[PDB]
Amino acid sequence: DDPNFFKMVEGFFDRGASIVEDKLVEDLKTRETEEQKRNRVRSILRIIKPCNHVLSLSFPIRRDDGSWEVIEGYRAQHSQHRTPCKGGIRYSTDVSVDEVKALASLMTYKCAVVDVPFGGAKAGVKINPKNYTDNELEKITRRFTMELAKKGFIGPGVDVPAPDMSTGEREMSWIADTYASTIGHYDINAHACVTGKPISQGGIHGRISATGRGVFHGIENFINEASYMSILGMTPGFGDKTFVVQGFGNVGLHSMRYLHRFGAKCITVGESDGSIWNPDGIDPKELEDFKLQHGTILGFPKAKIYEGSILEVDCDILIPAASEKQLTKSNAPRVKAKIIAEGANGPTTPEADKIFLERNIMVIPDLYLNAGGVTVSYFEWLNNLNHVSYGRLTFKYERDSNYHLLMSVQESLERKFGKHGGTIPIVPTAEFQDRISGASEKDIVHSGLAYTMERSARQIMRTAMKYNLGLDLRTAAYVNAIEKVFRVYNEAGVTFT
Amino acid sequence: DDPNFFKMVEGFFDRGASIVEDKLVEDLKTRETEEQKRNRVRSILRIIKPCNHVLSLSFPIRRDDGSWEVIEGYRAQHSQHRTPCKGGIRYSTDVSVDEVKALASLMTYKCAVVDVPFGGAKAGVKINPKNYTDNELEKITRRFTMELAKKGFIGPGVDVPAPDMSTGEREMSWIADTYASTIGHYDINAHACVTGKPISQGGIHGRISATGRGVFHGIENFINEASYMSILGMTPGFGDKTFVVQGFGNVGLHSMRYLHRFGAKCITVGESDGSIWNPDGIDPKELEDFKLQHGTILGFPKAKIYEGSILEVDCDILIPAASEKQLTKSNAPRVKAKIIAEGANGPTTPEADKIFLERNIMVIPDLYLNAGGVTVSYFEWLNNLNHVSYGRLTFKYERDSNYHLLMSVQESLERKFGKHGGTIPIVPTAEFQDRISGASEKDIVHSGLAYTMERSARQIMRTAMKYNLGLDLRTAAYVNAIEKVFRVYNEAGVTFT
Amino acid sequence: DDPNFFKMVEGFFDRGASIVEDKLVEDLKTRETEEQKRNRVRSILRIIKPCNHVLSLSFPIRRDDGSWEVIEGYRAQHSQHRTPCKGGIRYSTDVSVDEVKALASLMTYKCAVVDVPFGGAKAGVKINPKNYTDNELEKITRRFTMELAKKGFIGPGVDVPAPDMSTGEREMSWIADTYASTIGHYDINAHACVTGKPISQGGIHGRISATGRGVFHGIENFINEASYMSILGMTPGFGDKTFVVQGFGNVGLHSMRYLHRFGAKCITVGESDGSIWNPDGIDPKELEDFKLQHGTILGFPKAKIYEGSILEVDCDILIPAASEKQLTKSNAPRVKAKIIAEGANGPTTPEADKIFLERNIMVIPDLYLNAGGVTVSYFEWLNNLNHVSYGRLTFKYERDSNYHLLMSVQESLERKFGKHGGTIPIVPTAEFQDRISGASEKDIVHSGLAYTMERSARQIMRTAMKYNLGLDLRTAAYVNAIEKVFRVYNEAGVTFT
Numbered sequence A, B, C: 001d002d003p004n005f006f007k008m009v010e011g012f013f014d015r016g017a018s019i020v021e022d023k024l025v026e027d028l029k030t031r032e033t034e035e036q037k038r039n040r041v042r043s044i045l046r047i048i049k050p051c052n053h054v055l056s057l058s059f060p061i062r063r064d065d066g067s068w069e070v071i072e073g074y075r076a077q078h079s080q081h082r083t084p085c086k087g088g089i090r091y092s093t094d095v096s097v098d099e100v101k102a103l104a105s106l107m108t109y110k111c112a113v114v115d116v117p118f119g120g121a122k123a124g125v126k127i128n129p130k131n132y133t134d135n136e137l138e139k140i141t142r143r144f145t146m147e148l149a150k151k152g153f154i155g156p157g158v159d160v161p162a163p164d165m166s167t168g169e170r171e172m173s174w175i176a177d178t179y180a181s182t183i184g185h186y187d188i189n190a191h192a193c194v195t196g197k198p199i200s201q202g203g204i205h206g207r208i209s210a211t212g213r214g215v216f217h218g219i220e221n222f223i224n225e226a227s228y229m230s231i232l233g234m235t236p237g238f239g240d241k242t243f244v245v246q247g248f249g250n251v252g253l254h255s256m257r258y259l260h261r262f263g264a265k266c267i268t269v270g271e272s273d274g275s276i277w278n279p280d281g282i283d284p285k286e287l288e289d290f291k292l293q294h295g296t297i298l299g300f301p302k303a304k305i306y307e308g309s310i311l312e313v314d315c316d317i318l319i320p321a322a323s324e325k326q327l328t329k330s331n332a333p334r335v336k337a338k339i340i341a342e343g344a345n346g347p348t349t350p351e352a353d354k355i356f357l358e359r360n361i362m363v364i365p366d367l368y369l370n371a372g373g374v375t376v377s378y379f380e381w382l383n384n385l386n387h388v389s390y391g392r393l394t395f396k397y398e399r400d401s402n403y404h405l406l407m408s409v410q411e412s413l414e415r416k417f418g419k420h421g422g423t424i425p426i427v428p429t430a431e432f433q434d435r436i437s438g439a440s441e442k443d444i445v446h447s448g449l450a451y452t453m454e455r456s457a458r459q460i461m462r463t464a465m466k467y468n469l470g471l472d473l474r475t476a477a478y479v480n481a482i483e484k485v486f487r488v489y490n491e492a493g494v495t496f497t
């Protein structure tokens, strides 16, 4: 059980088309024959599936010891029905076009599941950042954008890179600075070419913790749904149950704190080295220190090394957040859990899905969970496309206008019950007192994220009941994804051909 | 005491770096040695200080008598950490690269003190507009932009000119029309290349009086601060004290009315010709007529000519708003005032500062006062970048929604106290009645300006206490300025070098 | 014996580097250590070898029956040391990135062997032109350029497509017309984006027969070299020996006529269907008719069907001109020939080379033979980059000036021997009479091609003796190729890295 990662995501898309194909002909309003309309649907589905562009590079670089190297680099743009196309830049010696093509596809559907205006994209670099000088990573990241930009694969109108595995705000700043100063110098939207930038360079409050909140608001939108918890046989709530984490990195890290702050007791955590198992809870603050002190989660003196993979650890909510294809046909029989959230991108093989549906354990699709990161990188790309600190124009104004609603209510009452002259004191609460001056930059993020992953969780529930998919929310997700991208191709007069 | 105007502003920047350098190493989070980190700070400070681009021109023109002339023209772009770069266009026979370089620097800090997304810039033209036909000024202004545009010094992504000395809305319209019709024709943001345009050409309510409000809200934010007025030995309030004005032009003019309407009695006013001294108040309306009738503030029959410079006149609030370096080591001993506001750009020599701190008289930095003009020209550049009359989308909607808050409150009460059926009339006040339909174009200006210069006045107070700078708010201003521009260079991975 | 076609061409490049590496260190003039210089050479060699860009596409098309299809399309740009990059566009259901990458590499060396200023490139389309309407091929070819152009893979400054397998002047006209009218409309060099265009659309006399002349002048430059014919044991001349042809298409066709007109008796010919064997000669005119009448070379009533592959036919000069990898380890033992020319691109597997060197049969590298086609498509790209019919400016002038050389010689003699008054008639010959008006468009082609493949044949001979490669001219060719591309990288300061 190790399919070509692109043949796998295609496999999910397949079961999606196998169910939509019927409810999609009846919504096609053209005037043709029944079979003809189906010969129209299946055709458009064959256009969605493949990637529309897969660039492939090679970089002469000069390492600090003067020697040269080549660096294969990739970038796919899955679909063009929606511009621009976002997608992270991954640094790993395990990246390939067969991987990038699929990760590129997912973000075409992630962005469709959470209603974000972007096509899919993804860029890889065969590289191990743990090997190279922090000068060499600059000469590599800047060259990698110099190559893309001149071939039309970076720019606020075509593609928007983003952080991903083994990349952070450090790299994303090198990109925005190279693009702004070479190609899109005159363009007013220069700095808006990448997301995940540092705050001082045009970022957004909580771009790092963005994905974590995703995993959080996702789990919350289901744990607090009794219709499934009655099936899974658990309790709506967090402090009553626990969870584990694969891949203590950005997702895994912030998936903890936001899920740790509400009573859910993070049992264990692991990484490429080993596992750290404590059935009583690990402080996400303290462990975060060792990643900056001891280089690994190992040695953590408030837990122990675990002779076994996290995926088999007894818990309540499994969260693979480290790499692809981790759960598989050989790990599925030994999960011993109830819910498998997904921070990583397609961490479950399609063979293991049936076993999970068979074992009666709910799998929440990665299309829905790690989509939080996108929906915040959208606010960033949209922040620095308007050139204004959101809400700055109307801080002093909203603060005044609200002080005149409450006043008018007061002045109005002091004429009806004011016969005694009694001063009715209409004053804000503690909560409203914060929201007087309006929506600050952080407020729309903590809301626009919690809202985007509210509508999405419904549209997934609303579908899985319409088609009776039970706990295969994944298939229900692709249905909502495919139905949306279809109406774009259908009405667009797909081509000039 | 007549330093090179660029060696002067550098001198202020110096005393700024001399205090930040310590509290800035500890905020640098890189992993190096102490001395190394200081070898990193001082280096970045040497990058901020100089101008990154100083163009220099020469114009063949054809005067109306057919003769040719050359016209030296300058433009500096101080820093590029923030695009675009705004900066006025000054017409004076006293402009030079040594001047423009410094005025360019100030606006890099002005924009940093009031948190406005622009680098600094400034453009000069060795010219005397009082000499040339109002046709020749067009052939000069249009040629001056034709030259800049083709070399990448005008355009909504690089630079945005603005009014300044001896230029008004007349000139700024010639620029926007030349740029829109030659270089950026196809660009959607063509007309957004300059600010200070006429309203019919995309201006903003009160762009002329914008700078005056700055000087006003600045003074107000300090006069109403007892912590200093206890030191200066005066009273928080305006009608109890007076003020004078140097340079009756745009700043000086509107600095009067907005400071005249609140009881502060404008004692005198002067210009290149002479002074007009009346210890009982000059009507800013009446005097404004003579500038359009008698060509000068002289002859004003409700005052007298003053055999002396304004800077020595007895008053309470001195406002130099005419030119640079006016106060100096020779004028400082004879100020006879309490507060010296600054409408002009660096009207005080650094030598006179010590004398002012010694004489125990508070000097409000020009970085803070005339920054109002920028913060409104930002709203303009941001108005005509969105292509919509701000608030037009939601006039009829907010008006309705507010009529349903007040109604719901009424309908809610008529069920609790409505046992008598008594019609509770929840109706807006007089004030709220204006703010029903929402934020109009003028409302955000009168607020966004009053708000921007609220946060700034605090950050300056908040610093001058943290470092104990007493009344040298100027040094406190640069500290806040330098700390902000530093975090941009620091995190940006300053160069690809 | 069926290596990955890119692992094969790499294999030749390898044996090339294995011999140059020594004679290339001594020509490196930098000041380093011996081993260091070798750590510099091997590094640059690792930069040359891989492709710098390999795009990959997918086309929604609308077949005439209304159904949709996807069409994978590829394009590689091997190297960028020389812009633009030429390369054909092949239509075949057997194309893939693993093929295009190598064919792209060859043209980086072809162009280096014949000193033509282009990097390598190649574009494929998984398609069978024998299946689609001649309308559908237009909707496919135009879309394929629309996709490339917007991503910077067509244009006289980056890439220049050209005819190749299953494409002719029909397709190349659709490309030039689509590019000229969409992307490079304003560009003055629009129509110069592709070569192989029809004459009326900016072609060159004999662009079709261009490659054939290549195969001809190549063979001639060796057959008339006794130094090898003494080794091979044959006779310098054509009418005394015969030859066969694989792949009667463009190359194979015109390889016949130009080699048929000089006595060499074309024995047989074959194609995807079958062979046509006549040991007495096939009229290239008559057989050309059946390709336009009977759809195949079969049925040709002046020969017979041959139960066997051409590659084993007894002859004197074998010319595979149909596809890749035709000769191989299984066909090498049964060649029964003396010289194997190569019209096709790498039609010989590296394993069969040793067998050919062992069997003492000379293999002429495809790098040298089919390079004629490029050297004419260069004249085209250079014709329509100058916007003038070459030689038109000086037809009437050269005709006059020559009539004054011959006259002056006459007038000069009629003073020395003119004592008798005898009219010396200095008049042109028959041959010169043609070349009076100068170099017409066709003359430079028939010369610039015959000349380009003169210098190249020497530099290959001049190398194979310097290094004693005997009859492995192929390895001698790559040596001259690598030595040239190396001096470009070496001196260029290879990167900004």
Ligand SMILES: NC(=O)C1=CN([C@@H]2O[C@H](COP(=O)(O)OP(=O)(O)OC[C@H]3O[C@@H](n4cnc5c(N)ncnc54)[C@H](O)[C@@H]3O)[C@@H](O)[C@H]2O)C=CC1
Residues within 6 Å of the ligand: A163, A164, A165, A166, A167, A211, A246, A247, A248, A249, A250, A251, A252, A270, A271, A272, A273, A321, A322, A323, A324, A343, A344, A345, A370, A373
């Ligand atoms: N971080 C983000 O912004 C986003 C991340 N994701 C997904 O989340 C996943 C992880 O987040 P990242 O930020 O990439 O974390 P990261 O970039 O910090 O690295 C993940 C960590 O997991 C560990 N790990 C990697 N492979 C492993 C394996 N096979 N077994 C055990 N441990 C392993 C590594 O030590 C690494 O520290 C990624 O796979 C990505 O697909 C998706 C969207 C946004």
Ligand SMILES: NC(=O)C1=CN([C@@H]2O[C@H](COP(=O)(O)OP(=O)(O)OC[C@H]3O[C@@H](n4cnc5c(N)ncnc54)[C@H](O)[C@@H]3O)[C@@H](O)[C@H]2O)C=CC1
Residues within 6 Å of the ligand: A191, A199, A200, A201, A202, A203, A383, A384, A385, A386, A387, A388, A389, A390, A441, B081, B082, B083, B111, B112, B114, B115, B116, B117, B118, B119, B484, B485, B488
């Ligand atoms: N290089 C570029 O083109 C960049 C452009 N931008 C744009 O600027 C706007 C900034 O808004 P926000 O940062 O959200 O406001 P904000 O109030 O969130 O500002 C965040 C930080 O930026 C600093 N800052 C503000 N103005 C500055 C200036 N003129 N110079 C140096 N530092 C300054 C402030 O001190 C604050 O610490 C964004 O909308 C973005 O579109 C932002 C970053 C880089």
Ligand SMILES: NC(=O)C1=CN([C@@H]2O[C@H](COP(=O)(O)OP(=O)(O)OC[C@H]3O[C@@H](n4cnc5c(N)ncnc54)[C@H](O)[C@@H]3O)[C@@H](O)[C@H]2O)C=CC1
Residues within 6 Å of the ligand: B163, B164, B165, B166, B167, B211, B246, B247, B248, B249, B250, B251, B252, B270, B271, B272, B273, B321, B322, B323, B324, B343, B344, B345, B370, B373
């Ligand atoms: N007006 C604006 O939009 C802004 C102005 N400023 C600063 O405000 C100052 C004045 O405002 P402007 O609009 O330029 O005024 P303005 O362009 O109307 O001219 C200033 C007036 O002051 C008088 N004056 C000039 N030099 C003088 C001297 N040495 N002694 C006595 N009188 C003199 C002149 O007669 C002139 O009428 C300028 O120096 C400029 O740096 C700063 C930001 C924006």
Ligand SMILES: NC(=O)C1=CN([C@@H]2O[C@H](COP(=O)(O)OP(=O)(O)OC[C@H]3O[C@@H](n4cnc5c(N)ncnc54)[C@H](O)[C@@H]3O)[C@@H](O)[C@H]2O)C=CC1
Residues within 6 Å of the ligand: B191, B199, B200, B201, B202, B203, B383, B384, B385, B386, B387, B388, B389, B390, B441
């Ligand atoms: N040349 C250009 O490209 C210009 C573009 N603009 C853009 O147009 C927008 C206009 O909004 P505001 O002026 O703030 O609205 P507004 O309500 O403030 O309009 C101000 C004046 O413009 C006049 N006006 C409005 N639409 C007009 C039209 N179609 N033709 C002639 N006059 C008209 C109105 O009568 C009004 O007196 C701005 O956002 C600006 O971005 C503005 C000026 C010039």
Ligand SMILES: NC(=O)C1=CN([C@@H]2O[C@H](COP(=O)(O)OP(=O)(O)OC[C@H]3O[C@@H](n4cnc5c(N)ncnc54)[C@H](O)[C@@H]3O)[C@@H](O)[C@H]2O)C=CC1
Residues within 6 Å of the ligand: C163, C164, C165, C166, C167, C211, C246, C247, C248, C249, C250, C251, C252, C270, C271, C272, C273, C321, C322, C323, C324, C343, C344, C345, C370, C373
């Ligand atoms: N024609 C040109 O302009 C140039 C051609 N070449 C090379 O010359 C070769 C042939 O020239 P083209 O113009 O492509 O000819 P073409 O495009 O007319 O087709 C070649 C012919 O050979 C036959 N053929 C193909 N594969 C075969 C196989 N496996 N067995 C038997 N017969 C087969 C086909 O029936 C076809 O008619 C190509 O492989 C190409 O690499 C190289 C440079 C320029």
Ligand SMILES: NC(=O)C1=CN([C@@H]2O[C@H](COP(=O)(O)OP(=O)(O)OC[C@H]3O[C@@H](n4cnc5c(N)ncnc54)[C@H](O)[C@@H]3O)[C@@H](O)[C@H]2O)C=CC1
Residues within 6 Å of the ligand: C191, C199, C200, C201, C202, C203, C383, C384, C385, C386, C387, C388, C389, C390, C441
């Ligand atoms: N669409 C475009 O931009 C094209 C531009 N060109 C340029 O035009 C130049 C033409 O030179 P050659 O064709 O080598 O000269 P040529 O003497 O070889 O002309 C070849 C044919 O073109 C025809 N022709 C010449 N001028 C014409 C015109 N104004 N309208 C229609 N047909 C005409 C002639 O009758 C002749 O049959 C080339 O240098 C090429 O650069 C050529 C073809 C297409």
Ligand SMILES: Nc1nc2c(ncn2[C@@H]2O[C@H](COP(=O)(O)OP(=O)(O)OP(=O)(O)O)[C@@H](O)[C@H]2O)c(=O)[nH]1
Residues within 6 Å of the ligand: A205, A206, A207, A208, A209, A210, A285, A442
């Ligand atoms: N690595 C790390 N990041 C943190 C930590 N605390 C907060 N952050 C991030 O830094 C940002 C600033 O935190 P706050 O000032 O508390 O604002 P906030 O958004 O209310 O913080 P949260 O509610 O925890 O998301 C947050 O949005 C988080 O994304 C922490 O302890 N460790």
Ligand SMILES: Nc1nc2c(ncn2[C@@H]2O[C@H](COP(=O)(O)OP(=O)(O)OP(=O)(O)O)[C@@H](O)[C@H]2O)c(=O)[nH]1
Residues within 6 Å of the ligand: B205, B206, B207, B208, B209, B210, B285, B442
């Ligand atoms: N030169 C000059 N300008 C004026 C005068 N009165 C108003 N203005 C400017 O013209 C604009 C229109 O004035 P109003 O209709 O009163 O609107 P406003 O913003 O409430 O006016 P103010 O509150 O005085 O700023 C104002 O914003 C001022 O900038 C005046 O008497 N003389």
Ligand SMILES: Nc1nc2c(ncn2[C@@H]2O[C@H](COP(=O)(O)OP(=O)(O)OP(=O)(O)O)[C@@H](O)[C@H]2O)c(=O)[nH]1
Residues within 6 Å of the ligand: C205, C206, C207, C208, C209, C210, C285, C442
């Ligand atoms: N298919 C085909 N093409 C031909 C034939 N004869 C000539 N051509 C091509 O058409 C062009 C015009 O031929 P010519 O007028 O004889 O000029 P040319 O260049 O002297 O012809 P060649 O010397 O045979 O190359 C030639 O350059 C050939 O490329 C032919 O019989 N069949």
